[PDB]
């Protein structure tokens, strides 16, 4: 009270000095019985990658995605994430993840990013400015390069316009550079739009092949199917806990509800769009979520000119959660509740007042 | 031949439980009192999404074809209800002029909504009849397919969805029991 | 409607609270209206923005 | 190396066209590409190097 009022001498009255908050005692985590591991091995340890002009988009779903396997392998030269930190990928759960697989030169790796330009960014593989996900790449000089040159990897050099985000153009129509039609035939100012990469084991790093996998992560108002390597814990009810339900997190007290969710509904919201119910992702029971109690803390004091004894009111909150007197205004501790009705001195609320009398604080 | 859609074509826009509340949502819905084409086979436009309904006793309608060419060449989405289940494929199927792979999945007034990934909502009720009900999602198909036209495989009605604003009324049990089309008339506004 | 003068006060105050609470769902240019989600995705220097 | 040089050539072609504000520049760059493409296919190192050096000067003129 003295610090709140910035005074050594405190006058008689009731002052709000702080906030009471019930703290969580444990953290409950629940996931469905998915023992499937996400097929990253089929992407990262694949024997063949697609050409950049015709990249391979594989969808990942209904599996456990352990990203420590990739992140901490140190087998990658590039691991750049946008909209997400690479160290939190295991905590997040996604509606899906897309793995876009292709081969480019080492000097072109910088083009695989939002906001970038260049023949790859513009004609082969375009990422949106608001791209969310991680770009992972590694040197594949000992995999794709061949002594006589590996020419099985194509890229687009010519196009009529730039690509839209995630647009895949695999047309082989002869590009018209000049004023006359090509009619599908190469010749004067007419060129096949795709060029090969001359990948050789003796190339300098800029010209060595790199295998690139772009993991696009979708975080939408929809159920996760791709979820990190987290264990489920026991369900705890009627206590203040932290929680995680398929990536849905918060702090609160959970109780069994009488709400009837439709067969397709996973969670509910109140009239102000605040989550107030969840379907446990294991037993499929519906629980209500109510926030852990909190309220202002007020100090009821006689002036420090008379006494340094104080009583403390915890607003709203029950005495079972915090001379203990439960009243409508909150839980009042330190004041003695008496039968005798006196003229009001320090008001508390809901008809209750307190005073210092023959001496101690009474309510 | 056209009929009055009345107040049909409403569905749960998401998978969130709500109750005793009026929720304002922006999505593709069949506009209230719009016209639906009455068929009693052809390839029809898909547009933004499709409202489909049928009234059958013999249960002749079996499925739908969705795509851009519906003639090999590229991928088409084939959804067929046969015997005890529904088989869904996205192969480069060669279809007949009169019909009746990257993804495969296996699962009276019947209302359906087909919209773009591709989601399917439906409602089945005993007895285009006037009244109100909401359709609910029964399958989510995570398919990267371009759909501009579709064909019905064997009376039925076809309407089209629009980016229409709706106010939906959820009852105590979280069921949508009523709705307002915010662009139908001044009173609804 | 006779007591509308008292009801109007109740409605205005209740409306003010509903308006305030609903603002928590707004992004204000952020990647998410939910603070807990921002902190579950981004590292400190990016989350701060 | 001829393959590294070919890759340099196509990088220069892309950039040279990218900054080719006028049409005459585009025409010259396309001609240079075609000559390099033929030289590459026929393993003519000197013609391929010549085009690359010419493209570098062309691009420098466009940028500076
Ligand atoms: C889906 O496929 C159709 C073609 O069946 C695409 O429509 C064409 O788009 C081009 C480019 O704008 C136009 O020149 C053609 O005239 C259109 N044809 C028709 C029949 O409309 C459509 O753009 C594709 N959609 C997506 C998302 O890929
Ligand atoms: C790829 O193979 C290596 C073999 O040493 C293994 O350590 C790594 O975890 C594998 N990556 C994936 C995604 O399976
Ligand atoms: C998970 O396994 C338990 C048995 O240990 C079972 O009771 C529960 O219903 C299963 N849940 C799911 C989603 O498979
Ligand atoms: C406050 O303390 C002073 C002594 O410094 C005393 O004279 C005065 O009467 C006291 N007032 C009250 C209300 O206790
Ligand atoms: C406090 O909790 C008890 C149950 O243990 C309940 O009977 C009582 O009414 C509660 N009081 C308040 C103010 O919530
Ligand atoms: C009021 O007096 C009765 C005895 O007559 C006692 O049982 C009750 O606890 C008293 N109330 C308070 C707040 O002390
Ligand atoms: C439906 O079509 C008829 C013509 O057959 C037309 O008169 C009527 O106004 C149309 N109704 C709507 C809602 O478009
Ligand atoms: C339905 O057709 C599929 C082939 O598309 C077949 O595999 C399935 O067994 C058939 N089911 C019944 C019940 O006939
Ligand atoms: C909710 O379901 C119960 C049956 O458990 C039913 O009696 C009640 O009328 C339903 N409420 C509404 C608003 O339909």
Numbering used by the authors:
A (entry chain A): 299 to 620, 641 to 676, 690 to 694
B (entry chain B): 27 to 66, 81 to 140, 166 to 172, 188 to 196, 200 to 210, 216 to 242, 264 to 298
C (entry chain B): 943 to 991
D (entry chain E): 1 to 64
Report text from the authors:
Severe acute respiratory syndrome coronavirus 2 (SARS-CoV-2) is decorated with spikes, and viral entry into cells is initiated when these spikes bind to the host angiotensin-converting enzyme 2 (ACE2) receptor. Cao et al. designed small, stable proteins that bind tightly to the spike and block it from binding to ACE2. We set out to design high-affinity protein minibinders to the SARS-CoV-2 spike receptor binding domain (RBD) that compete with ACE2 binding. Unlike antibodies, the miniproteins do not require expression in mammalian cells, and their small size and high stability may allow formulation for direct delivery to the nasal or respiratory system.
The best designs bind with very high affinity and prevent SARS-CoV-2 infection of mammalian Vero E6 cells. Cryo–electron microscopy shows that the structures of the two most potent inhibitors are nearly identical to the computational models. The very close agreement of the cryo-EM structures of LCB1 and LCB3 with the computational design models suggest that the main challenges to overcome are not in the de novo design of proteins with shape and chemical complementarity to the target surface, but in recognizing the best candidates and identifying a small number of affinity-increasing substitutions. The large amount of data collected in protein-interface design experiments such as those described here should inform the improvement of the detailed atomic models at the core of Rosetta design calculations, as well as complementary machine-learning approaches, to enable even faster in silico design of picomolar inhibitors such as LCB1 and LCB3.
